[PDB]
């Protein structure tokens, strides 16, 4: 169950929001090349 393209980008700001997010392996490798959870997604949210 892959999470690629703009469908990864829209999900990033849904979790991170005003905190912001990065892309640094990388997040595209962890969630698009494979499958991740939303916890392995909020690890890429920029520090509040």
């Amino acid at each position: 169950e892959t999470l690629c393209g703009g469908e990864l980008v829209d999900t990033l700001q849904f979790v991170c929001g005003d905190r912001g997010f990065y892309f640094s392996r990388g997040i595209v490798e962890e969630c698009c090349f494979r499958s991740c959870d939303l916890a392995l997604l909020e690890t890429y949210c920029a520090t509040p």
Partner: protein, 466 residues
């Protein structure tokens, strides 16, 4: 699209929101949740009631499944697009409808919080459409009726003291708790417990109107539960005292009984209307004689500075029975449409300044002081937005409650997040001597944040040692 309370048989109609065009819930900074109620949204794919931004990522299919859950009307959008987490798991949204008798702009679907694991979106919508009973908030102490209506938090809630910023409890003492950000206190809850490890738990839901103690004249207010204790239903009780002063008080915790919760609130609203000692006069033993301010108690005055048209009445209500915008208010900041009190006439105090040889009159406990942004720049009311004028912090296309810092947002796009003050408006009049001013006129001396206004009144009355 219709739910009934099994106990009362009260009909709930939410069909006034069944627009297929729907409404836009706000997340992040420019995030858009195109959503609808009872029907499918138009921006989202067919069948989908709510979705995401550039891509049409569903967070649940549209249905009529409406539930009554402890004063709340829940709507469940199930079977959306698959979510990351694990195999088989899809997105879902629980859109709740909480009772709110006070109509206004904040009557929109907000995103309170989200659970990552279960892929469930918590939604809260506060409308008078979801209200069964009235706003029972007043009790009778003899012939005079005591009300708790000013103490209603209408933007969020009261943060509780760290008994033994990181909070512990959230409290709302008549209407259900208002939806905050990132803190998922179950919609409809009155008292909320937030532990360090674990989600918020419902330790309070509004039961009935306040009860009265016959002996030492205390007022109590009960808040039951919908979730069980660790020895059986939870419960929370709030006790009230009479503490006269500038502060309106805040619900503090005193006893943590294993299945109960005791909150002690010291507030001047749980005090009777005390009739003044010597009518409308001043007496200090330093001079020993009295100043008769009853000569000024004749009528209304209109002191104005920078568009702000105040109304001052020494020993008399600011605005009379005609306009009557600011009830109890001794000073009232007029707008012609709203009005805001700067101190209840009943709370009047007279003191003698020995430095300037002046007489100080002060009212207290008016309206809630104006909100500011987190940076420190005060908000500006009223402001235009898309073609509408606004009176308080709103929530359009933004997560937390925001205001404008200009007269117009559409024109200047200047804004910040609101942080509300837990203090109420005060007003004072420093009477200064002048011999030729038989019946003088007060003037604005100092306006501080709109949270305090001091007037300088020059009269003949506050003089004679001749």
């Amino acid at each position: 699209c219709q739910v009934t309370n099994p106990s009362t048989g009260h009909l709930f109609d939410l069909s006034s929101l069944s627009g297929r065009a729907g409404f836009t819930a706000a997340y992040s900074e420019k995030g858009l949740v195109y959503m609808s109620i009872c029907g499918e949204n138009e921006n989202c794919p067919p069948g989908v009631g709510a979705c995401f931004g550039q891509t049409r990522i569903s967070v649940g299919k549209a249905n009529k499944r409406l539930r009554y859950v402890d004063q709340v009307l829940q709507l469940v959008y199930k079977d959306g697009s698959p979510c990351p987490s694990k195999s088989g798991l899809s997105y879902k949204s629980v859109i709740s409808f909480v009772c709110r008798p006070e109509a206004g702009p904040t009557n929109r679907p907000m995103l309170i919080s989200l659970d990552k694991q279960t892929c469930t979106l918590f939604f809260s919508w506060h409308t008078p459409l979801a209200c069964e009973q009235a706003t029972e908030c007043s009790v009778r102490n003899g012939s005079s009726i005591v009300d708790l209506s000013p103490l209603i938090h209408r933007t969020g809630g009261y943060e509780a003291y760290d008994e033994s910023t990181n909070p512990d409890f959230y409290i709302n003492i008549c209407q259900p708790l208002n939806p905050m950000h990132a803190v998922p206190c179950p919609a409809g809850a009155a008292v909320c417990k937030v532990p360090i490890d674990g989600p918020p738990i419902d330790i309070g839901r509004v039961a009935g109107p306040p009860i009265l103690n016959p002996i030492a004249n205390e007022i109590y207010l009960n808040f039951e539960s919908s979730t069980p204790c660790l020895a059986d239903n939870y419960t929370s009780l709030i006790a009230f005292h009479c503490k006269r002063g500038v502060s309106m008080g805040t619900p503090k915790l005193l006893r943590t009984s294993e299945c109960d919760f005791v909150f002690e609130w010291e507030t001047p609203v749980v005090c009777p209307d005390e009739v003044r000692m010597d009518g409308c006069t001043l007496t200090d033993e330093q001079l020993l004689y009295s100043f008769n301010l009853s000569s000024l108690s004749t009528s209304t005055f209109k002191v104005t500075r920078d568009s702000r048209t105040y109304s001052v009445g020494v020993c008399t209500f600011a605005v009379g029975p005609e306009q009557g915008g600011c009830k109890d208010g001794g000073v009232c900041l007029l707008s012609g449409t709203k009005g805001a009190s700067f101190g209840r006439l009943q709370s009047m105090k007279l003191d003698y300044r020995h430095q300037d040889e002046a007489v100080v009159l002060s009212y207290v406990n008016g309206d809630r002081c104006p909100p500011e942004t987190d940076d420190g720049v005060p908000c500006v009311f009223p402001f235009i937005f898309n073609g509408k004028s606004y009176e308080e912090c709103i929530i359009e296309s933004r997560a937390k409650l925001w205001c404008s810092t200009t007269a117009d947002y559409d024109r200047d796009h200047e804004w910040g997040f609101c942080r509300h003050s837990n203090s109420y408006r005060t007003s004072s009049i420093i009477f200064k001597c002048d011999e030729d001013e038989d019946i003088g006129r007060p003037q604005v001396f100092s306006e501080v944040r709109g949270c305090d206004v001091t007037f300088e009144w020059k009269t003949k009355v506050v003089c004679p040692p001749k």
